Every structure is written in structure tokens, then in C-alpha cells.
Design a protein around this ligand. Structure first.
Ligand SMILES: CC(C)[C@@H]1C(=O)NCCN1c1ncnc2[nH]ccc12
Length: 164
């Protein structure tokens, strides 16, 4: 049920789209959130996904952290997708604005391999401060399962395609 995507490789696809609007249209098995280790969904992809769930994602997330403690940078957890998807895979890419090791970006993308198909953003890009061209290259060289990437900014989408 994904439509309008450009094929990059055997298993990676890309579209200029808001991931929240794509999740509402497709209702995929798995939507990836660009999480932080505290699961505090304030802005960027995480803030937008949480707003679309009417804050239910944040309430579930706070219970998960109260039980388990914070995630690791490079780690993930599977929670409910609420009204957007069956599941949300909360994945923590390194935040370069906080001095986190960019080598952890490959570890972050390895979490995608546990799921046959995912709707996802570019990890560590946007407000996380990493180069999106680098994030797309790590994605293509790490993920083996079928990934549908939604890139919100049209100018960035065009650059990602034309430099691929
Ligand atoms: C992570 C970035 C590459 C990307 C981008 O193009 N500009 C910044 C935000 N972002 C998103 N990309 C997809 N869906 C989104 N919904 C909310 C934010 C967002």
C-alpha cells in the first residue's frame, strides 16, 4: 500500500512526504520514530508523531521509561503505533549537536533489520544535526529489510536523489 516512492536499491525506497501524513494514509505495520534516549517527543519527527496521537505516544513512553530506564544511543524499543501504525519502533540515532558518536548511526539503522517492512525518517538528520546525505548512505549500506523513507523537505529530497 505504499505509493509514489522512488526506488533507490533492491530494498530502499524514498518519497518527499511528511512521515505523519504518510502513516495516516498507509497505516503501516511499523512506523519508525526519531527518538531520544528519554523518549521525550518534543519536536521534529518525534514531536509531530506524538501530536498526531493526541499525546498518547508520550503517555505510553513515560510509563516505559519509568519501568525500564532510558534507551542507549543506537538502541530501540517497540511500542504501540496508536492511530498511525500497528507498532512504533523508537530508534535513537546519535545527536551530533550533543557530541554523540556518529559511528552509532550504523548501530541505530541495524534495529530496522528486525522488521520486514518499515516506514521511516532519515536517522540523525533534521534537528539531530547529522548530514542527511551521509544518513541515507548508512541506511542503504546497513538495512536489508524493506524501508520506505519519507523526507519532509522537498529541497533536501531533490538533493538526496540527484547525488545518490
Ligand atoms: C529528518 C529530516 C531529514 C526531515 C527533513 O526533511 N526536514 C526536517 C524534518 N524531517 C522530517 N522528515 C520526514 N517527516 C517529518 N515529519 C516531521 C519532521 C520530518
Amino acid at each position: 500500500s505504499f505509493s509514489g516512492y522512488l526506488k533507490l536499491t533492491d530494498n530502499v525506497y524514498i518519497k518527499n512526504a511528511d512521515i505523519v501524513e504518510e502513516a495516516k494514509k498507509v497505516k503501516p505495520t511499523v512506523v519508525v520514530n526519531a527518538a531520544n534516549v528519554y523518549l521525550k517527543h518534543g519536536g521534529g519527527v518525534a514531536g509531530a508523531l506524538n501530536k498526531a496521537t493526541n499525546n498518547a505516544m508520550q503517555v505510553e513512553s513515560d510509563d516505559y521509561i519509568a519501568t525500564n530506564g532510558p534507551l542507549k544511543v543506537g538502541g530501540s524499543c517497540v511500542l504501540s503505533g496508536h492511530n498511525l501504525a500497528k507498532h512504533c519502533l523508537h530508534v535513537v540515532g546519535p545527536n551530533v549537536n550533543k557530541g554523540e558518536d556518529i559511528q552509532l548511526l550504523k548501530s541505530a539503522y541495524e534495529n530496522f533489520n528486525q522488521h520486514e517492512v518499515l516506514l521511516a525518517p532519515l536517522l540523525s538528520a533534521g534537528i539531530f544535526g547529522a548530514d542527511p546525505i551521509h544518513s541515507l548512505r548508512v541506511c542503504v549500506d546497513t538495512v536489508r529489510t524493506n524501508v520506505y523513507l519519507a523526507v519532509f523537505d522537498k529541497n533536501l529530497y531533490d538533493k538526496l536523489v540527484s547525488s545518490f
